[PDB]
């Protein structure tokens, strides 16, 4: 998650710094947050122990 | 068989006899509220006192709990020991316990159910005897802490073998493993019987239907590749859908709609099954929210049909039922909304149904055709029938207008039907 | 009869499929098949247009 | 005209539908808490479409 | 206790009569999506 | 003479009878509770 979250952090960060007409809404972060949560749920859903 | 194996069977049968002090310590230590050390020190009177108060609070929430104050939570139940009871008496006891687990199924979020249930765990040892019912009622709370406590104090049946690893484990059972448990066919028959009892008793609630639907939907997804295993699922889960449609509760009906749709897209089915499927959907369709979901299901089912008669007219009995539960104005609204799903095959079968059985709605056919674009073959079938109508039925201003509509759109195809017919 | 399908191969193995039935300077492909990994060497449709056989040599 | 052209005209009649795979509904479990049944049934339709 | 001697139970009845619940692919002119019926010569 | 109802209640607690309970369990039919 640290790898996934950091990668999305740069995307959300670059849009913050280099956007000429950024709206103070955080939409890019919010959609980015959804992707990380989806990765988290699938990553956590897996169980190493055999069932 | 070895002597050890037979003794193991003897050990299981006498699991709750409490022969000696050590056996009493294990049986009495099992608890949902207290740790092992404090649990052993407690007395049956103390446990009953808390439960008696707890059941009273539950009775305030729902009056039905008050009945069990007469049978399971009576002062005389303290002296009642299951081992010394005869076979007939135990079955009578199990019926009362099974009924209680249904009421408590929906209130596990409330603390009093945990105190009300502790009496049954300690006194009647349901966690050893009625383990299947307890797990099934609490199956949908699998991510809650209370389910974790249940797994710790419970010996798993053969069918619940997938949950063994999550016994006394920090992580709660994952959603993926819950699919694996439902994947087993024997479990589905077991769950279907339990779900059948809930329908009979009107004991269902939204959380149960949501969780039950997902596992059923997910199971079809996991078996999508295997056509043979899908064929084995059809007798069971469709039979469930028939029961769900029978419930007067609207939430149960919507679940049947959700379940039915996934099979039709997952597996093509005979038009006889699809036709019968509608009749059950429309027979008990009263709630508005069910009516919305149903109409979405009806069109989706036809879309899966891919055989001769794909767009043939509905039977006379079916058409009358559909019109009663869905007036023409309602569908004209359905076709009106821009986000309507693909439903052309149903509209074609519906359109041909109108001509055969109703002459007054012929103006409605013109309105419908404008709203939704039908595919080339479907247009040809409609023109073929309306040509027959003109020869049999009297020529009407609306009838010629429907032709005139086809004259405007794709005039050449109108000749082709006329050439083939006359 | 007019064709309703068009497939465009590629060296990378991608196969873009267009619905000829539905015009613009840039049309969107209906799907981007990428199961094969090598250069696409044969693109053939069934006579009825229901099967596309893509092979790499 | 001929019968085959009718058959081919039917084949062109098909429109693509989204097949159901294993990893199509697994996300449903995540957001299955405190949701009305109708809203859930809509999500099933959306992924199916 | 039991004797045989829109009705809701139509869906249950049709399941009982039919044993093969898949439409015969012979009549359908449109081939199945994921399973191909192919034989070598 | 037969005992009064009050005596029957007291006799139940003194002797710890469970017949009244067991009878209800047999009479317990699930549909009425719902």
Chain C hits for D8, Cβ within 8 Å: 1, 48
| Tokens 């640290």 sit on residue | A2
C38: alpha, beta or left? (left if phi > 0; alpha if psi -120 to 50): beta
Scanning D20-39 for CB atoms below 8 A from C yields none
Asked if the C-beta of B203 comes within 8 angstroms of chain E's C-beta atoms, the answer is: no
> Could you write out the DSSP letters of every residue in F1-34?
-PPPHHHHHHHHHHHT--HHHHHHHHH--HHHH-
Give dist(CA D28, CA B253) in Å, integer: 19
Half-sphere exposure of B81 (CA within 13 A, CB side): 6
Residue B280 is nearest to which of E10, E21, E27, comparing CB atoms?
E10
Buried/exposed D8-41: b ≥16 CB within 10 Å, e otherwise: bbbebbeeeeeebeeebbbbbbeebeeeebbebb
| Tokens 């307890």 sit on residue | B134
Cα B231 to chain centroid distance, Å, stands at 19
Chain A residues with CB within 8 Å of chain B CB: 44-47, 49-51
Q: How far is F4 from chain B (nearest CA, A)?
A: 21
C-alpha triplet B337, B342, B343: angle, nearest 5°: 90
Give dist(CA B159, CA F16) in Å, integer: 40
Buried/exposed E1-33: b ≥16 CB within 10 Å, e otherwise: eeeeebeeebbbebbeebeebbbeeeeebbeee
| Tokens standing for residue B381 | 């079938």
Tell me if D10 and E34 make a contact (CB, 8 A cut-off).
no
Q: Which helix (H) or strand (E) holds E13?
A: helix E10-17
Q: Which of D27, E4, F4, D14 is nearest to B304 (CA)?
A: D14
How buried is A45 (Cβ within 10 angstroms: 0-12 exposed, 13-18 middle, 19+ buried)?
middle
> In terms of C-beta distances under 8 Å and separation of at least 24 residues, what long-range contacts does B329-338 make, across chains too?
B330/B295, B331/B295, B331/B368, B332/B364, B332/B367, B332/B368, B332/B371, B334/B295, B335/B368, B335/B371, B335/B372, B336/B371
How buried is B121 (Cβ within 10 angstroms: 0-12 exposed, 13-18 middle, 19+ buried)?
buried
Asked if the C-beta of B174 comes within 8 angstroms of chain F's C-beta atoms, the answer is: no
Q: Which residues are paired to C42 by β-bridges?
A: C55
Asked if the C-beta of E30 comes within 8 angstroms of chain D's C-beta atoms, the answer is: yes
- Backbone Cα Rg of chain B: 29
Per-residue HEC secondary structure of chain B comes to CCHHHHHHHHHHHCCCCCCCHHHHHHHHHCCCCCCHHHHHHCCHHHHHHHHHHHHHHHHHHCHHHHHHHHHCCCHHHHHCCCCCCCHHHHHHHHHHHHHHHHHHHCCCCCHHHHHHHHHHHHHCCCCCCCHHHHHHHCHHHCCCHHHHHHHHCCCCCCCCHHHCCCCCCCCCCCHHHHHHHHHCHHHHHHHHHHHHHHHHHCCCCHHHHHHHHHHHHHHHHHCCCCHHHHHHHHHHHHHHHHHHHHCCCHHHHHHHHHHHHHHHHHCCCCHHHHHHHHHHHHHCCCCHHHHHHHHHHHHHHHHHCCCCCCCCCCCHHHHHHHHHHCCHHHHHHHHHCCCCCCCHHHHHHHHHHHHHHCCCCHHHHHHHHHHCCCCHHHHHHHHHHHHHHHHHCCCCHHHHHHHHHHHHCCHHHHHHHHHHCC
Q: D45 in helix, strand or coil?
A: helix
Give dist(CA C21, CA B117) in Å, integer: 65
Buried/exposed C19-53: b ≥16 CB within 10 Å, e otherwise: eeeeeeeeeeeeeebeebeeebeeeeeeeeeeeee
Tell me if E34 and D14 make a contact (CB, 8 A cut-off).
no
Scanning B362-421 for CB atoms below 8 A from D yields 375-378, 380, 416, 419-420
Cα B345 to chain centroid distance, Å, stands at 27
Q: Which residues are paired to C54 by β-bridges?
A: C43
Q: How far is A41 from chain D (nearest CA, A)?
A: 8
Chain B hits for F9, Cβ within 8 Å: none
PDB resolution in Å:
3.7
Asked if the C-beta of B233 comes within 8 angstroms of chain E's C-beta atoms, the answer is: no
Give dist(CA B212, CA B231) in Å, integer: 20
Asked if the C-beta of A23 comes within 8 angstroms of chain D's C-beta atoms, the answer is: no
Measured torsion, CA atoms of residues B320, B322, B323, B327, in degrees rounded to the nearest 10: 170
Question: Going by C-beta distance under 8 Å and a sequence separation of 6 or more, which residues neighbour residue B46?
Answer: none
Q: Which helix (H) or strand (E) holds C43?
A: strand C42-45
Chain A hits for B164, Cβ within 8 Å: 51
| Tokens standing for residue B407 | 């004259």
Q: How far is B139 from chain E (nearest CA, A)?
A: 27
Give dist(CA A29, CA B172) in Å, integer: 30
B156: alpha, beta or left? (left if phi > 0; alpha if psi -120 to 50): beta
Asked if the C-beta of B42 comes within 8 angstroms of chain A's C-beta atoms, the answer is: no
- Backbone Cα Rg of chain E: 18
Buried/exposed B303-337: b ≥16 CB within 10 Å, e otherwise: bbbbbeebbebbeeebbebbbebbebeebeebeee
A17: alpha, beta or left? (left if phi > 0; alpha if psi -120 to 50): alpha
Question: Going by C-beta distance under 8 Å and a sequence separation of 6 or more, which residues neighbour residue B119?
Answer: B47, B48, B51, B72, B73, B77
Neighbours of B8 (CB within 10 A): 11
| Tokens standing for residue B120 | 């049954």
Strand order across the C5-8 sheet = C5-8, C15-19, C31-33
Buried/exposed B104-120: b ≥16 CB within 10 Å, e otherwise: bbbbbeeebbbbbbbbb
How buried is A24 (Cβ within 10 angstroms: 0-12 exposed, 13-18 middle, 19+ buried)?
exposed
Regarding chains D and C, contact by 3 or more CB pairs under 8 A is answered as yes
> In terms of C-beta distances under 8 Å and separation of at least 24 residues, what long-range contacts does B42-46 make, across chains too?
B44/B78, B44/B122, B44/B123, B45/B78
Chain F hits for B196, Cβ within 8 Å: none
Give dist(CA E14, CA E29) in Å, integer: 25
Give dist(CA A10, CA B339) in Å, integer: 37
> Which residue of chain D has the CA closest to B177?
D26
Q: How far is B140 from chain A (nearest CA, A)?
A: 16
Q: Experimentally, how was this structure solved?
A: cryo-EM
Asked if the C-beta of D11 comes within 8 angstroms of chain E's C-beta atoms, the answer is: yes
Q: D20 in helix, strand or coil?
A: coil
Give dist(CA C46, CA C4) in Å, integer: 12
| Tokens standing for residue B146 | 């209370």
Contact by Cβ (8 Å): B355, B385: yes
| Tokens standing for residue A10 | 């740069």
Cα F3 to chain centroid distance, Å, stands at 15
Residue C8 sits at φ, ψ, to 5 deg, of -125, 115
- How many residues are given for chain A? 51
Give dist(CA B150, CA B32) in Å, integer: 7
C-alpha triplet A35, A37, A38: angle, nearest 5°: 65
Q: C6 in helix, strand or coil?
A: strand
C51: alpha, beta or left? (left if phi > 0; alpha if psi -120 to 50): beta
Neighbours of B54 (CB within 10 A): 22
Give dist(CA B307, CA E27) in Å, integer: 6
How far are the Cα atoms of B58, B144, E2 from residue B149, in angstroms, in the given order? 21, 9, 44
Asked if the C-beta of E38 comes within 8 angstroms of chain C's C-beta atoms, the answer is: no
């Amino acid at each position: 998650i640290a790898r996934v979250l950091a990668a999305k952090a740069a995307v959300s960060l670059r849009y913050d710094a280099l956007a000429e007409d950024r709206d103070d809404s955080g939409d890019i972060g919010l959609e980015s947050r959804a992707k990380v949560e989806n990765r988290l749920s699938q990553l956590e859903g897996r169980d190493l122990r055999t069932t | 068989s070895s002597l050890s194996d037979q003794l193991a069977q003897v050990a299981s049968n006498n699991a709750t006899v409490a022969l000696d002090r050590k056996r009493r310590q294990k049986l009495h230590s099992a608890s949902l509220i207290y740790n092992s050390k404090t649990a052993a020190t407690q007395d049956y009177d103390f446990i009953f006192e808390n439960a008696s108060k707890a059941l009273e609070e539950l009775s305030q929430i729902e009056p039905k709990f008050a009945i069990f104050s007469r049978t399971l939570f009576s002062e005389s139940s303290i002296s009642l020991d299951r081992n010394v009871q005869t076979k007939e008496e135990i079955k009578d006891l199990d019926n009362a316990i099974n009924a209680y687990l249904l009421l408590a199924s929906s209130k596990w979020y409330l603390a009093p159910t945990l105190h009300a249930t502790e009496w049954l765990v300690r006194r009647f040892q349901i966690h050893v005897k009625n383990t299947e019912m307890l797990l099934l009622s609490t199956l949908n709370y699998y991510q809650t802490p209370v389910f974790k406590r249940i797994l710790s104090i419970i010996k798993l049946p053969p069918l619940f073998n997938c949950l063994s690893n999550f016994v006394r484990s920090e992580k709660p059972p994952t959603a993926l493993t819950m699919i694996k448990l439902f994947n087993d066919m024997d479990f589905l028959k077991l769950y279907t019987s339990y779900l059948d009892q809930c329908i009979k008793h009107n004991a269902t609630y939204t959380n149960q239907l949501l969780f039950t639907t997902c596992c059923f939907i997910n199971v079809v997804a996991f078996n999508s590749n295997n056509d043979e295993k899908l064929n084995q699922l059809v007798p069971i889960l469709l039979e469930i859908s028939a029961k769900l449609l029978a419930s007067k509760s609207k939430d149960c009906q919507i679940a049947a709609h959700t379940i039915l749709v996934v099979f039709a897209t997952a597996l093509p089915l005979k038009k006889t099954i699809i036709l019968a499927a509608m009749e059950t959907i429309l027979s008990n369709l009263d709630a508005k929210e069910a009516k919305h979901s149903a109409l979405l299901t009806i069109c989706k089912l036809f879309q899966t049909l891919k055989g001769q008669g794909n767009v043939d007219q509905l039977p006379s009995k079916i058409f009358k039922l559909f019109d009663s539960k869905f007036d023409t104005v309602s569908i004209l609204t359905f076709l009106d909304k821009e986000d309507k799903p693909v439903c052309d095959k149903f509209i074609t079968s519906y359109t041909r149904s109108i001509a055969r059985y109703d002459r007054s709605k012929l103006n409605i056919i013109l309105s419908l055709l404008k709203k939704i674009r039908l595919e080339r073959y479907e247009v040809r079938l409609i023109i073929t029938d309306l040509i027959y109508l003109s020869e049999i039925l009297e020529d009407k201003s609306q009838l010629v207008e429907l032709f005139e509509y086809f004259i405007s759109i794709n005039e050449d195809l109108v000749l082709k039907c006329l050439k083939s017919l006359g | 009869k007019q064709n309703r399908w068009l497939a465009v191969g590629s060296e990378s193995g991608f196969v873009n499929l267009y619905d000829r039935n539905n015009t613009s300077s840039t049309p969107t492909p209906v799907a981007a098949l990428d199961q094969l990994t090598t250069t696409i060497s044969n693109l053939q449709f069934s006579p009825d247009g229901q099967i596309l056989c893509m092979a790499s040599r | 005209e001929d019968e085959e052209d009718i058959a081919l005209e039917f084949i062109n009649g098909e429109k693509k539908d989204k097949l159901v795979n294993m990893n199509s509904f697994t996300s449903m479990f995540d957001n299955i808490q405190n949701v009305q049944m109708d809203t859930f049934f809509d999500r099933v339709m959306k992924v199916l479409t | 206790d039991e004797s045989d001697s829109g009705d809701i139970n139509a869906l249950t009845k049709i399941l009982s009569t039919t044993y093969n619940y898949k439409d015969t692919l012979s009549n359908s002119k449109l081939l199945p999506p994921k399973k191909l019926d192919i034989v070598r010569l | 003479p037969p005992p009064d109802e009050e005596e029957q209640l007291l006799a139940k607690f003194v002797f710890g009878d469970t017949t009244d309970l067991q009878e209800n369990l047999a009479k317990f039919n699930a549909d009425f509770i719902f």
